[PDB]
Amino acid sequence: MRIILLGAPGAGKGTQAQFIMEKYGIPQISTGDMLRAAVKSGSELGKQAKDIMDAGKLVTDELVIALVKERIAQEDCRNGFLLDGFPRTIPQADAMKEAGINVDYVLEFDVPDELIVDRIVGRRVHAPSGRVYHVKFNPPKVEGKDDVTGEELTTRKDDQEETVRKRLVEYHQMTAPLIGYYSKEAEAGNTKYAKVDGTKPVAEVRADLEKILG
Numbered sequence: 001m002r003i004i005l006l007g008a009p010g011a012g013k014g015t016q017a018q019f020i021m022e023k024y025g026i027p028q029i030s031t032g033d034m035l036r037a038a039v040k041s042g043s044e045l046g047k048q049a050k051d052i053m054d055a056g057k058l059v060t061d062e063l064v065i066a067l068v069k070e071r072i073a074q075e076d077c078r079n080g081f082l083l084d085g086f087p088r089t090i091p092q093a094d095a096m097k098e099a100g101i102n103v104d105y106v107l108e109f110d111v112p113d114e115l116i117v118d119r120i121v122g123r124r125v126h127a128p129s130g131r132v133y134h135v136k137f138n139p140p141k142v143e144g145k146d147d148v149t150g151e152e153l154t155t156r157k158d159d160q161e162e163t164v165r166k167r168l169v170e171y172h173q174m175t176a177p178l179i180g181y182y183s184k185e186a187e188a189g190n191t192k193y194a195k196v197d198g199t200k201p202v203a204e205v206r207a208d209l210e211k212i213l214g
Ligand SMILES: Nc1ncnc2c1ncn2[C@@H]1O[C@H](COP(=O)(O)OP(=O)(O)OP(=O)(O)OP(=O)(O)OP(=O)(O)OC[C@H]2O[C@@H](n3cnc4c(N)ncnc43)[C@H](O)[C@@H]2O)[C@@H](O)[C@H]1O
Pocket: 007, 008, 009, 010, 011, 012, 013, 014, 015, 016, 031, 032, 033, 035, 052, 053, 056, 057, 058, 059, 060, 061, 064, 085, 086, 087, 088, 089, 119, 120, 122, 123, 124, 132, 133, 134, 135, 137, 138, 167, 198, 199, 200, 201, 202, 205
């Protein structure tokens, strides 16, 4: 099974991706997590991403495409995968389409702009795994610790209000058109498309997604 998650920044995509991955035994493919890891380790492909993410700007189509095609050739992607953060632009989507990569589900998360900032400012992550928490809305079992490893959570350098505003602007301009792109794909019988209310509690959105996938 192959899935793509659509939605504005902080809509809850990464959060819900964790549940799908464990349930369906398919790997989460997060371009945001790769880019941050590349910066961290200084990987040839992705190292350059530091300043761009800082400014709240999108990284080049070609860099991310390369990261995805490299990552997606991996063996763990034999039986399917979940795309989370890719595609982010129309050319990114088209690159994937003409490579002959079709998916089964495109899942859109519907979340109002006014909720995004307070979500992102309270976000805490476990960098090694990509697991995400919220200090008020979705806290770890033990404060400041990852549930799975118990390791100290951190805050992303680009999770400040001003930076978040910029990502929003970028999304509505560059990424929003992907909704129509895949709605069109769905009508061609190339995939199934669905939208969920991303303002429900984490448990409920997970249940909604499972009704669609299971
Ligand atoms: N394909 C690409 N092409 C070019 N550049 C790319 C790229 N991909 C990445 N980049 C680059 O890297 C940057 C960052 O992108 P990215 O790594 O994706 O972070 P983002 O833009 O800030 O938004 P996310 O997609 O990480 O949010 P989310 O949908 O996962 O919501 P989350 O589960 O975290 O949850 C949000 C918060 O609220 C909480 N929360 C989650 N669910 C709920 C709920 N149901 N109710 C209440 N609170 C909730 C959480 O615990 C959390 O704190 C870009 O700006 C760019 O430079």
